[PDB]
Amino acid sequence: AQSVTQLGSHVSVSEGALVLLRCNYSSSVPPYLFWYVQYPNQGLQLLLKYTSAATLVKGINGFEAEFKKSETSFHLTKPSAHMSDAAEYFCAVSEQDDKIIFGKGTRLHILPNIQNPDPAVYQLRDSKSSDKSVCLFTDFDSQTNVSQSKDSDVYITDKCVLDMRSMDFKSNSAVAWSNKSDFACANAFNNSIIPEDTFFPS
Amino acid sequence: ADVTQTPRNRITKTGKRIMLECSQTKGHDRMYWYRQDPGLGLRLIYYSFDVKDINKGEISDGYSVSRQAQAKFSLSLESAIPNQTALYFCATSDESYGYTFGSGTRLTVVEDLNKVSPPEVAVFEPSEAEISHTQKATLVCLATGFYPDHVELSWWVNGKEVHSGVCTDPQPLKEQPALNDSRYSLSSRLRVSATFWQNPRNHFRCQVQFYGLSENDEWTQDRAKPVTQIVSAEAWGRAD
């Protein structure tokens, strides 16, 4: 039962919105189908599987998938995206009566609902010497994305979402740094489209 | 079974013969070796239905296997090359696709062990302007100058490992992207209330577990031998 296709290596969903991760298969005879999840740093965990019993299969945590042979699909859904759903998901199929073959995987990114954005660029100092520092772009919403650096002596990370449980509060950030004496936090993110109201403390 | 794999982490030079081992306790006829690479999923290398049976999967070139017992299925890299750097997963199946995976072997193949290097780690303390504007405080950890890209970063507050308020980059960046053997760097943030940062009793540590050379490996340089090790950096809260 030859292939299984997942569409998009990286996909986004709004926090609180319907999760939907697509999988299709090619196999004339209906195959068994599997959805695995892999949280970072970890192994694979089976969420649910279609084994020719219920076509609507329920799994742990509100995950479900419907097998639909008429459009050779087995799309995974969950009714509401939580930050803890950030992971890579793999659809898989039985093949040649002897093995499971894996789709390429899709990573789910959950965009936090940021009701009061407070974009800002801050400067942080090494705890052991005033002279080394980094720049932190933080507290922008989902409409901002950070661009890779212009200049090969300036390093800029991808945006990252942290979830402070103590305050039920999530925020985006990216980090930039350079060893050049030319380097200023005011200019660090000049290759990014930032909010017009980004705070730049003196 | 309890499916168990060894080793859990390994770094090797190119051109060496390397052995991975899977053992199970349930005695399932079917065992499998896969590798996992970003964007490619899990690809089958070889599998076996009994001691007398070996079948190729999609990427069997460069590898061999032996099914020495009902319980054991060995994978070999015959002569390791860098593109065999990957996460490797053993699995067993019952007769109804009930798979059990082992927890993984992270393997890195490097051309030249002379280029191995542990990270330098620094913690950057929260901005006062952040503290004033938001009443929150974001620490930033930076690990730089390490090779290969085979580390684990964690945060420790008053001696315990914390997960809340942490975001670590998923992938390190290349310090010299033009070079095949560029050193790497990685960043992480830990955000706390200003209140908690402001207390001089609280201690914050960024810990990086680095995987490199073992006690066995030859080392000819004057600089420190770059053995598997932990490198931390730290900061204490402060009122001002």
Side-chain angles (χ1 to χ4, degrees), chain A residues 38 90 97-100 104 118 122-127 139 155 157 160-161 163 165 171 173 177, chain B residues 32 34 36 41 47 49 97 99 123-125 127 130 133 138 164-165 167 175 185 187 189 191 234:
Chain A
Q38 181 177 229
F90 300 87
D97 191 59
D98 66 12
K99 75 172 71 71
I100 289 178
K104 293 173 141 56
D118 196 7
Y122 299 110
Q123 182 174 359
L124 285 62
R125 291 198 187 174
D126 192 328
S127 53
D139 299 344
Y155 299 101
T157 77
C160 212
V161 191
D163 175 7
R165 306 272 76 253
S171 58
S173 69
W177 73 94
Chain B
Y32 306 82
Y34 289 82
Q36 173 175 30
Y47 62 108
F49 276 45
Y97 301 83
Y99 261 49
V123 170
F124 296 79
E125 303 182 341
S127 166
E130 176 192 15
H133 190 75
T138 306
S164 173
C167 204
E175 296 179 346
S185 51
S187 84
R189 321 91 172 106
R191 200 173 205 178
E234 84 196 316

